[PDB]
Structures are given as structure tokens and as C-alpha cells.
Structure 1
């Protein structure tokens, strides 16, 4: 029995051990209560405005589109405190944890980004934060690990399984199954068991709400399409949500194609995986023919997650959103192009969305189209990654 629908068509659900259902049911009730509570909404809005810096700008990119009939705006989540959109929803979930009387936060992290966002929200709101990170990810994300520790979070390396994101996820759930009376599990994307896909969407939907208001103010009409990268699905569903009922507005999600779909070294389960049940949810995932959970790949660690949020799988199945992929090399070119022509260093995650918009422009340069790319984060964190690739291929 739930208050809200745990499914998006065939996708979603609550596939957790029985011992964790009370924690999910408690969380759903607290969320439904909070959504009706003007005091909660006022507190959340106040943090978003005065701490995180909302609203974020909507920037018209004139140099990039010169000579074409594309008008391209970037929604500037790179200007959000923490440098990525993740900050929006961790502030909401931190307030939910307090509404429930929880004093501790559990979080999982691969690229470090959600770990940092969880740590900063926990530091601000006086919660004791512990973060599970696969040991392989600890090794290659030492800057984000240090940020987490500077913010007072406890970072716990995970050595089981493949020592990466899914193994950190398991360890977070194992911990929560015994600690949920005092700890909240602050899941980091629009995936996992219900109610998380719903909560994370609702706590990210200001991205699209603002985008709609800003584009109407600047252009007097809705976008032809809004384009967002998809690792787990949170920045994309945050941009999409307020446009779902505007049926003229295209919704385009971009999965990482890695070295190319045909190589198998990619992160595009929605279009190139197989539906499975894991991560607490029924969703497309990368898996062996036997049903063992596989490893994804992307140049961008933030997109390196072998499943996808169930609402995206649903929006795809009914044709409301379209999903595409962008390779490492395409994302790298979009990264360089934004730096050089607009003076903005984009996250390599977001560069996947930008790369697809650039393709939409370049393939049909006389097509009139008003596009918004969700610039989900800034790319300071990526400059060493981009430097080393550029030097290895002989550009530097």
C-alpha cells in the first residue's frame, strides 16, 4: 500500500528487501506531507535562493550558433552552489530528513559529485553525513573525496564486488536496512525504489519551471526542444518535468556512448540495455546475458551508471521523450567549443547534451529551432581529464 503510484507504466516499483519497506513508506508519507506544507516549501525555497543561488541564469549562446537558424540557450546549473544541479535536491532531502527526525545522512557516490552535494547540505543543516564510495572511485576522485572530508563527511571506501558505484549503492542500502530509524538515505539520482524517482524529480523540477519562465520572457514562446544528459536521470527529469504537458516541446535525453555503442563500452542502458530488476527498481540496465549487472563506461564519471531512472524509460516507451547517445569524442569537442566560443567550461556530463544540440544545429543549419541545453554543471573538475586526453592524442 502506497500513497503515490510507484510505477511509470511497467517501470519503477519498490524492489527492496522486506525490512526496508517501512523506511520507504515512512519517506513517502513524509514527502507527501512536506509537499502540502507551506512552511516546508518556504524553507526549501529560502535555501535554494539565498544559499544555493537560484534562480540560475538562462544564457543565450550567440557565437556557437552563428550562421545557422538555431537559437541556443544554456540553463546555467553550472552557476549553482557546488557547481552542479545536484545541490537542489540534496537540500530538499536534507529538509525531509529533519522533518522525519533523522540526524544522520547516508549517501552513495561514484564520481564524487553527489557525495560533495550530500556533504555540503549535511554541513549546512547540521546532519552527520556518511558517504559510501567504491574503492576504485575513491582512487580516481581524490579532489572530491577531500571536499567531502573538508565538509565534515565520513567517506567509507567500498571494496566488495567491482568496487564502484553499484557496489557503493549496495553498501548504502545494507547500512540503511539496519539504521533507518536514525539515518536517512539521501539517494543521488531519479532512480532507485519508490519514492525516490518521484522525490528527486519534484526537488529538481525548478530547473524546468525557471527555464519555461525565462524563455517565455526572452523569446515569447516555448522551446522547440530541451536537451539534457542522462546518467541516472535527475537533471534531465528536472528540466523535462514542467514541459511534459506542453506536447509541442521536444524532450531529448542524451546517454553516454563512450567509445561507441557498437564497442559495448558505453553507458546507454535506456536504448541499448535490457530491462532488469535491481537498484530497487524495474528499469533498463546493462547486464550479462545471464542477468549479472554489468559495467558501463563514459569519459564522464558522472554518467557512468549502468541503469536509468524509470520515468525516463516510461517517457521513452510512450514516445513523449526521445533518447540518443553521444560519444566521448563528441562530448570532448563540445567541451572545447563552449570554452573557446562562449567562455564557459562545461562539465563533461553536460557536454554530452551540448554535443547533441550542436549536432542538431550542424546537421540541419537552415532549420529554425529554439533549443535549451541543461548545462547541469561546470567543468573545472574535468580539466585534468581533458588535458590528459588532449596530450595523449597529440593535441598538447
Structure 2
């Protein structure tokens, strides 16, 4: 029995071993309670304002859109403390941990970004943080590993399975199943078993709430569309949620197309995978014909969660949101464009959202449209990746 619906239509649920159900029920009750508690809301608002830097700017991009009828704004989550939107929800989940009497945090990370986010929130709130990371990711992500350790987190290299994101998720859950009396599992996107897709949306929804207020103030109307990249679904649902009932507002989610959908080397399960049950949920995922879970491929490691949040699968199924893909080369060109024309270095994740808006603009340059891209993060972390690719094809 749950307090809230665990499903978004047919998608979602709580597909975890029986031993974990009391951990999810406890978390759901704490969340339901927190959301009614003005003191919890005030504490969360205080961290978001005075620690993280909320509200974030909404930047117009007249240099990019010159000569067209597109007006383009970027929601500047790249300016949040930590350099990505992940910070919003780790702060809320750290407060939920404290609410439940927990002094320890467990988190998973792929290439380190959510590990750093979890580590910074845990440092601020005085929680003992342990982060599972696939040994292959540890080797390749020295800067993130070092950040985590500087912040007092324990980084635990995962040698099991294929030593990557999936195995890290698996070890985090195994640990939590035994330690949940004292430890909270700080899941890194709007996916996994209920209540996580709901919690992470509600702890990201200030993105779209601020966007709505800022666009109303600057333009006197709602956007024609808001556009966000989709790895797991958290920045996108954060931007989308407050606009779901504004039926005129397009909601466009951009999955990574990798080397191109037709190569099979992509990370677009919502539109090009097949519904399965894994990660505690029923959702589209990357999987073999006989149902072994596979990996997503993207130039952007942050977009490599091989499934997608169940609310995105639902919003797609009813036609409320539309999902598209952007390839590695498309994202690279958008990265270069923003650097050169606005002096903002975007995360390669966010560059997928921007690339799709550029396409909306360029394909139809006389279409009147007011677009917001969720600029989910900064791209300093990506300059070596970008350098190497451009050098390798003699583009530089």
C-alpha cells in the first residue's frame, strides 16, 4: 500500500526485491510529510537561495537568433553551485535524509557528476557520504573522483558485472537494503522505483517555476516550447512540470542520438528502445532481443542512463510531450556555437537541447517562436573531449 500512485499510466512502479519495500515506503511517507511541512520548505528554500544561488538567470540569445523570427532564452542551471541542475535535488534529498533521522548517504555515479553533487550536499549538511562508481569510470574520471574525495566522500570502486553505471546502481541498492535504518540512498535522476521519480521532479520543479515567472516578466506570455536534454529525465521534468497544465506550451525532450539512431550506437531508449522492467521500474530501456540490459552510448557520459524516467514515457504516450534525438556531431556544433556567439561553454548534455532548438530555428527561420532551452550545466568538464574530437578529424 502506498500514499501516492507509483505509476504514470502503465510506466513506473516499485519493482524491487521485497526486502527494499520498507525503505521505499519510509521514504515516500517522509516525502509526503515534508511537502506539507512549512519548516522543511523554508529550510530547502534557504539552501537553494543562499548556498546554491537560486534563482538562476534566464539569458536571451540575440546573437544566435539574429535574422530569424526565433527568440531564444537559456535557463541558466550552468550557474547553479556545482555547475549543473543536479544540485537542486541532492539538497532536498539530503534534507529528507535528516528528516528520517539518517546520518549517512549512499549514491551511485556513472562518470562522477552525481557523485560530486551527492558529495557536496552531504558535506554541507554534515552527512557521511559513500559513493559507488564503476571501476572503469573511476579510472577515466580522475577529476570527479578527486572532487568527491576532497569533499570527504568515500569513493568505492565497483568491480562487479561490467564495472560501470549499472553495477554502481546495483551496489548502491545492495548496500541500502542492509543499511537503510541509518543511510539514505540519494538516487541521481527522476527514474528508479517510486517514490524517486516523483521526489526528484518535485525537487527540480523550481527550474520551470522560475522560467515561467521570468518569461512572463520579460515577454508577457508563456513560451511556445521548452526544450531539455534527457539522460534519465531530471532536468527535463524539472523544466516541464510547471508547464504540464499550460497545454499551449510544447515540452520537447532530447535524447542522445550518439553516432546516429540507425547505427544502434545511441542512448535514445524512450523512442528507440523497448519497454522492460529494470532499475525498479517499467520503462523503455536499451536491451537485447532476449531482454539483457544494455548500455546507452553518447559523446556525453552524463546522458548514458540506459532507460528513462517513467513520467517521460507517460507524457510521450499521451502526446503531451514530444521526444527527439540529437547526434554527437549536432551536439558538438551547438557547443561550438554557444561558446563563440554568447561566451557560454555549455555541458555536452545541455548542448543536445540547444542543438535541437538551433534546428527548430534554422529549418524554419521565418516561423515566429519563443523558445527556452534548459541549459542544465556548464561545459568546462567537456573541453578535453571536445578538443580531442576536433583535433582527431583535423577540424582544429
CA distance in structure 2 between the partners assigned to 1:282 and 1:36 by the alignment: 29
- State the secondary structure of the residue aligned to 2:64: coil
CA distance in structure 2 between the partners assigned to 1:260 and 1:138 by the alignment: 28
- State the secondary structure of the residue aligned to 2:73: strand
CA distance in structure 1 between the partners assigned to 2:332 and 2:196 by the alignment: 32
CA distance in structure 2 between the partners assigned to 1:156 and 1:55 by the alignment: 34
How far does residue 394 in structure 1 lie from its aligned partner after superposition?
0.4
How far does residue 362 in structure 1 lie from its aligned partner after superposition?
0.2
* CA deviations over 1:104-153 (Å, ceiling 9, x no partner): 00000002110000000000000000000111111111101100000000
In the alignment, what sits opposite 2:336? 336
Q: Equivalences for 1:6-155 in 2 at 5 Å?
A: 6-155=6-155
CA distance in structure 1 between the partners assigned to 2:55 and 2:112 by the alignment: 24
In the alignment, what sits opposite 1:253? 253
* CA deviations over 1:36-72 (Å, ceiling 9, x no partner): 0000000000000000000000000010001000000
How far does residue 159 in structure 1 lie from its aligned partner after superposition?
1.1
The normalised TM-score by structure 2 is 1.00
- State the secondary structure of the residue aligned to 2:63: coil
CA distance in structure 2 between the partners assigned to 1:232 and 1:377 by the alignment: 15
CA distance in structure 2 between the partners assigned to 1:304 and 1:137 by the alignment: 12
CA distance in structure 1 between the partners assigned to 2:201 and 2:147 by the alignment: 26
CA distance in structure 2 between the partners assigned to 1:111 and 1:212 by the alignment: 32
- State the secondary structure of the residue aligned to 2:247: coil
CA distance in structure 2 between the partners assigned to 1:295 and 1:231 by the alignment: 12
CA distance in structure 2 between the partners assigned to 1:94 and 1:62 by the alignment: 39
CA distance in structure 2 between the partners assigned to 1:318 and 1:138 by the alignment: 40
* CA deviations over 1:215-263 (Å, ceiling 9, x no partner): 0000000000000000000000000000000000000000000000000
Give the gaps of 5 or more residues in structure 1.
none
CA distance in structure 1 between the partners assigned to 2:117 and 2:153 by the alignment: 11
CA distance in structure 2 between the partners assigned to 1:274 and 1:98 by the alignment: 38
- State the secondary structure of the residue aligned to 1:241: helix
CA distance in structure 1 between the partners assigned to 2:216 and 2:358 by the alignment: 22
- State the secondary structure of the residue aligned to 1:257: strand
372-381 vs 157-166, which moves further: 157-166
CA distance in structure 2 between the partners assigned to 1:243 and 1:379 by the alignment: 27
- State the secondary structure of the residue aligned to 1:212: helix
CA distance in structure 1 between the partners assigned to 2:166 and 2:370 by the alignment: 37
- State the secondary structure of the residue aligned to 2:275: strand
CA distance in structure 2 between the partners assigned to 1:195 and 1:305 by the alignment: 18
How far does residue 296 in structure 1 lie from its aligned partner after superposition?
1.1
- State the secondary structure of the residue aligned to 2:228: strand
Give the gaps of 5 or more residues in structure 2.
none
CA distance in structure 2 between the partners assigned to 1:11 and 1:161 by the alignment: 27
CA distance in structure 2 between the partners assigned to 1:40 and 1:59 by the alignment: 31
Q: Equivalences for 1:1-396 in 2 at 5 Å?
A: 1-396=1-396
- State the secondary structure of the residue aligned to 1:172: helix
133-142 vs 252-261, which moves further: 133-142
How far does residue 163 in structure 1 lie from its aligned partner after superposition?
1.1
Give the alignment's Cα RMSD to 1 decimal: 0.4
CA distance in structure 2 between the partners assigned to 1:305 and 1:200 by the alignment: 15
How far does residue 162 in structure 1 lie from its aligned partner after superposition?
1.4
CA distance in structure 1 between the partners assigned to 2:394 and 2:263 by the alignment: 23
How far does residue 342 in structure 1 lie from its aligned partner after superposition?
0.2
How far does residue 156 in structure 1 lie from its aligned partner after superposition?
0.6
* CA deviations over 1:73-115 (Å, ceiling 9, x no partner): 0000000000000000000000000000000000000021100
| Number of equivalenced pairs | 396
